[PDB]
Amino acid sequence: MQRNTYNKVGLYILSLAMLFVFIIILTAKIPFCFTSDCSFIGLKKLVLTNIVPIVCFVFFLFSIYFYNRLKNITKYNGQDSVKITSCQSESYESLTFLATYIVPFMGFSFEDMQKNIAYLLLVVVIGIIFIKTDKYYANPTLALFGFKLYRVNILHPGSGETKNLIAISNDVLKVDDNVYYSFFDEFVFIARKKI
Amino acid sequence: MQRNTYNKVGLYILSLAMLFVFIIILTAKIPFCFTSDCSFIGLKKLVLTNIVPIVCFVFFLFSIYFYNRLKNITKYNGQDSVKITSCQSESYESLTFLATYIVPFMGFSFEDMQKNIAYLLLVVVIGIIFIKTDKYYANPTLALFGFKLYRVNILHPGSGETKNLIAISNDVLKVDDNVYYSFFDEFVFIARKKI
Amino acid sequence: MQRNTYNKVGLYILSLAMLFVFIIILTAKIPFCFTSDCSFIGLKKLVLTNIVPIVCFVFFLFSIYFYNRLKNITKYNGQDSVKITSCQSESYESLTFLATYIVPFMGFSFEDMQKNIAYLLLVVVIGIIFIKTDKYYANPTLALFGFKLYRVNILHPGSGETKNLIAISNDVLKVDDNVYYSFFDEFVFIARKKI
Amino acid sequence: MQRNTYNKVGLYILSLAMLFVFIIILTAKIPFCFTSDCSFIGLKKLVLTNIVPIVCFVFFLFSIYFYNRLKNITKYNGQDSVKITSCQSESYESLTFLATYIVPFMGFSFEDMQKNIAYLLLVVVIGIIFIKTDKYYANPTLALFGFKLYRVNILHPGSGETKNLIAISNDVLKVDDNVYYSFFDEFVFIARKKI
Numbered sequence: 015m016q017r018n019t020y021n022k023v024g025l026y027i028l029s030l031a032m033l034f035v036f037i038i039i040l041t042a043k044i045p046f047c048f049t050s051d052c053s054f055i056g057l058k059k060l061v062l063t064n065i066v067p068i069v070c071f072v073f074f075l076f077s078i079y080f081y082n083r084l085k086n087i088t089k090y091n092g093q094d095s096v097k098i099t100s101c102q103s104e105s106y107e108s109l110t111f112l113a114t115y116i117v118p119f120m121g122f123s124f125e126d127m128q129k130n131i132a133y134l135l136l137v138v139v140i141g142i143i144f145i146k147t148d149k150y151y152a153n154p155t156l157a158l159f160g161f162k163l164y165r166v167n168i169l170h171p172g173s174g175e176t177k178n179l180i181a182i183s184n185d186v187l188k189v190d191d192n193v194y195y196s197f198f199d200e201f202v203f204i205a206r207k208k209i
Numbered sequence: 210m211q212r213n214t215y216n217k218v219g220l221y222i223l224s225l226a227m228l229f230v231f232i233i234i235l236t237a238k239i240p241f242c243f244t245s246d247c248s249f250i251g252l253k254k255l256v257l258t259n260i261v262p263i264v265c266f267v268f269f270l271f272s273i274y275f276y277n278r279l280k281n282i283t284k285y286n287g288q289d290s291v292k293i294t295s296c297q298s299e300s301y302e303s304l305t306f307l308a309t310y311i312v313p314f315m316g317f318s319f320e321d322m323q324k325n326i327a328y329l330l331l332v333v334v335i336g337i338i339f340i341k342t343d344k345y346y347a348n349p350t351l352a353l354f355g356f357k358l359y360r361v362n363i364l365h366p367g368s369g370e371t372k373n374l375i376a377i378s379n380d381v382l383k384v385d386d387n388v389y390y391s392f393f394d395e396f397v398f399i400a401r402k403k404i
Numbered sequence: 405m406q407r408n409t410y411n412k413v414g415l416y417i418l419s420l421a422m423l424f425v426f427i428i429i430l431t432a433k434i435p436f437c438f439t440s441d442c443s444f445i446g447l448k449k450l451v452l453t454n455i456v457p458i459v460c461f462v463f464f465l466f467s468i469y470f471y472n473r474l475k476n477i478t479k480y481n482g483q484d485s486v487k488i489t490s491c492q493s494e495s496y497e498s499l500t501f502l503a504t505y506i507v508p509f510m511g512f513s514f515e516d517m518q519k520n521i522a523y524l525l526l527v528v529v530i531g532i533i534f535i536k537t538d539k540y541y542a543n544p545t546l547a548l549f550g551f552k553l554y555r556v557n558i559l560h561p562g563s564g565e566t567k568n569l570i571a572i573s574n575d576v577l578k579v580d581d582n583v584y585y586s587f588f589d590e591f592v593f594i595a596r597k598k599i
Numbered sequence: 600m601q602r603n604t605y606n607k608v609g610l611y612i613l614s615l616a617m618l619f620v621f622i623i624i625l626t627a628k629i630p631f632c633f634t635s636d637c638s639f640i641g642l643k644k645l646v647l648t649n650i651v652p653i654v655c656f657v658f659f660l661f662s663i664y665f666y667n668r669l670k671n672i673t674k675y676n677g678q679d680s681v682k683i684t685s686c687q688s689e690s691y692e693s694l695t696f697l698a699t700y701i702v703p704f705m706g707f708s709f710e711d712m713q714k715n716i717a718y719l720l721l722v723v724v725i726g727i728i729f730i731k732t733d734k735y736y737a738n739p740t741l742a743l744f745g746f747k748l749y750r751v752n753i754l755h756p757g758s759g760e761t762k763n764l765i766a767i768s769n770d771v772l773k774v775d776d777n778v779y780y781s782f783f784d785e786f787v788f789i790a791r792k793k794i
């Protein structure tokens with residue numbers, strides 16, 4: 015706990031960034047006007063009527079920070095290559111996330127605050143079950159930024175072959191290719207596809 | 210029937226505890242008055258206003274009781290050990306269950322009573338099909354409390370090997386591991402790692 | 405076409421009986437009056453305000469008739485036995501059908517008639533895709549009445565090893581049991597579990 | 600990029616035709632009154648009160664145009680045959696594209712324009728993830744028009760065999776059921792079943 019659990023939580027908060035921008039687009043009660051007699055009402059009621067865009071904004075900066083901490087593991091190391099023996103695509107495991115765990119929150123109505131406490135508890139419970147599930151690599155935000163999630167079986171030049179790894183890659187991979195690595199956990203590594 | 214059916218119903222009522230706490234949080238309609246104008250309006254119309262959180266409260270105590278009756282399985286004789294040959298982490302169930310059978314109830318509006326009778330009938334029909342569907346081990350309330358559901362293939366020192374069992378383990382298991390069992394049913398056993 | 409398509413349409417109309425029951429429970433605005441002031445409005449207004457419960461009632465009688473036409477095939481030719489060589493329980497397809505194709509109908513609001521035309525078009529389009537989708541045996545109404553859907557490979561005494569058949573059974577089956585067949589199509593047969 | 604991406608975007612716009620038909624049926628505020636005092640309000644406010652049927656109409660003609668291009672990819676070539684070694688039906692991967700990605704759109708209320716901007720962003724995001732998701736052959740509009748999507752492993756008479764191809768076809772296929780190809784990408788080809 016407290017290192018692998020925090021890494022998986024930082025992967026999960028990245029997976030909810032599309033939900034936070036969806037709620038910000040959905041239920042922001044901004045007074046969009048261009049007339050002369052529609053002057054500023056003040057920061058007090060503008061903050062008070064826009065509570066859930068403010069909270070989803072703070073969570074969106076948290077998702078941006080965790081994306082930065084994900085790129086910080088491909089910053090440092092990774093001048094070593096392996097060979098893929100069996101690559102099966104698992105990008106659809108990202109998209110079913112967007113099919114199931116995000117669009118019901120589009121379906122709800124964020125008017126009363128008690129229902130918002132219920133939806134926040136649903137997000138927290140989905141996170142706690144999602145941490146310990148060995149499917150935490152599913153991401154709408156990562157798969158939206160060109161990355162593809164593959165199930166590979168790498169083979170090291172000197173150690174041997176390790177089975178059932180998950181490769182987040184920037185380009186397409188196939189059987190008998192040459193990729194780099196930067197291991198997030200003992201399950202997920204970022205590939206780079208040496209040409 | 211009966212006893213095995215009652216054990217599976219007791220596993221199913223445990224699977225719905227998060228739904229009952231979501232309905233209690235969602236539609237409570239309790240007077241939360243910080244103002245001095247709102248006094249106690251009376252117990253009778255407070256009970257008559259809150260009908261679905263009272264019923265979901267009673268079902269929540271039923272889920273707590275069935276969790277206690279699940280823990281009574283591992284209270285008694287569990288002092289044997291086996292060896293694990295396959296350890297396929299089928300813990301993604303209790304997350305498709307959560308967002309396919311518990312999340313759609315959160316979007317309904319629990320206002321008119323015929324609609325509540327329809328939702329109760331949906332819960333009953335989902336339960337009747339879920340008893341005999343070979344996937345009754347999926348449990349959001351169990352997977353909240355650290356438990357991981359594994360598809361396992363055990364081997365006994367004296368009898369032999371038995372195929373396709375389900376282990377509700379407390380900690381992570383792998384191939385060639387020693388666990389202590391307590392058999393809930395002929396398909397699902399509570400396992401604890403021996404270390 | 406025709407006859408095989410009509411049999412698959414009958415199985416699909418059988419698969420939608422719980423939806424018609426749910427709509428009849430949901431949106432029937434019957435005037436349940438115990439008071440002495442609520443007299444009869446008339447049969448005309450009771451019919452005109454309950455149009456879609458009447459339509460779902462007619463479809464429920466069609467589902468009952470197609471259940472009768474399914475049960476007609478266990479009567480006439482069932483004096484032969486076969487042996488199951490590989491049984492895998494596929495009773496979860498019915499529950500995924502119930503949770504995915506019937507539950508989202510329950511959350512719609514059946515008030516404006518244009519929306520009702522849209523939902524009827526969704527039912528028709530789901531049926532047209534569901535006839536030819538190779539998974540037409542999924543059924544909430546059949547799995548409610550004790551039937552379990554299995555994937556078996558029968559062994560004939562003198563004909564061969566026709567594999568990949570779908571067995572609707574009244575009781576549990578495993579490897580090496582004898583079952584009485586009554587073929588519906590070239591894919592789905594009703595077993596009987598010869599003791 | 601470009602051309603392959605444009606072909607996959609065309610297949611995705613073909614995949615969404617039933618959604619545009621459903622929205623046009625759902626939220627068209629057309630004054631369907633046969634009364635004598637139901638005069639024309641005017642073209643301008645008829646256009647302004649029906650903005651999202653107009654947008655979904657334009658997208659429906661785009662889906663019709665991309666269906667025309669998919670027929671143009673089979674107009675020209677397609678005078679060579681292969682042999683099929685392993686045929687597995689995958690038409691259900693079409694239908695799960697419906698009930699998870701097109702069904703929950705009709706539960707939304709298309710009244711306020713901010714919510715419509717959110718739903719359009721959801722369509723765009725589902726499209727961006729669905730291009731690279733390796734399951735882009737899923738189709739409600741194609742599977743409506745008799746086409747079945749199979750997973751085949753063709754064998755050429757002179758070149759050899761190729762594994763894991765996806766065949767869109769008009770009639771039922773099996774092993775040793777020679778077909779004519781009209782290859783769209785390196786993954787999806789249109790079969791014709793040379794008798």
